Design a protein around this ligand. Structure first.
Ligand SMILES: OCc1ccc2nccn2c1
Ligand SMILES: OCc1ccc2nccn2c1
Ligand SMILES: OCc1ccc2nccn2c1
Length: 147
């Protein structure tokens, strides 16, 4: 029935069914639709004090907690989903990855190159789809599959 990683769940505040993906952490009301050697993705990274390197082009010393980083990620996802801001604009302004300068674009990659939670989420996304918060040793990511 449902494509890889997708499950049905129950809204606590409304009672309506929704869909959640335990590989990408995406969630949506709509029933999802449904592997290539390579995918292309953009991402927005928010680092935290336990990141493998807690420093970035934005801040010499990253001191925010992982919980604070998750709140920031959740807020960016809200703004992207409402259309108030674009993914590319938020990545350019706020991603702690040097790829911020390229609107978050990482280029194309195969399995075996990225950190595993990032790789698994990227390959479970369909072209055009966006992840929820994805956790790695670098921090917390929002991933957009572009090809
Ligand atoms: O896959 C269909 C789909 C997924 C996500 C979504 N968000 C708003 C409308 N949406 C439709
Ligand atoms: O962080 C790795 C990476 C990937 C792509 C890229 N484009 C501009 C800077 N960039 C950095
Ligand atoms: O190989 C990873 C990497 C690092 C730095 C960088 N700058 C532009 C593209 N880039 C890719």
């Amino acid at each position: 029935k449902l494509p890889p990683g997708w499950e049905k769940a129950m809204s606590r505040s409304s009672g309506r069914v929704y869909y959640f993906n335990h590989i990408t952490n995406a969630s949506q009301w709509e029933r999802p639709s449904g592997e290539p050697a390579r995918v292309r993705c953009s991402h927005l990274l928010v680092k935290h004090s336990q990141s493998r390197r807690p420093s970035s082009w934005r801040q010499e010393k990253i001191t925010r907690t992982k919980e604070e980083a998750l709140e920031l990620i959740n807020g960016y996802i809200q703004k992207i989903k409402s259309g108030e801001e674009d993914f590319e604009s938020l990545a350019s302004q706020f991603s702690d990855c040097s790829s911020a300068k390229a609107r978050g674009d990482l280029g194309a990659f195969s399995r075996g190159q990225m950190q595993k939670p990032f790789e698994d989420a990227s390959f479970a996304l369909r072209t055009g789809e966006m992840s929820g918060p994805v956790f790695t040793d670098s921090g917390i990511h929002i991933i957009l599959r572009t090809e």
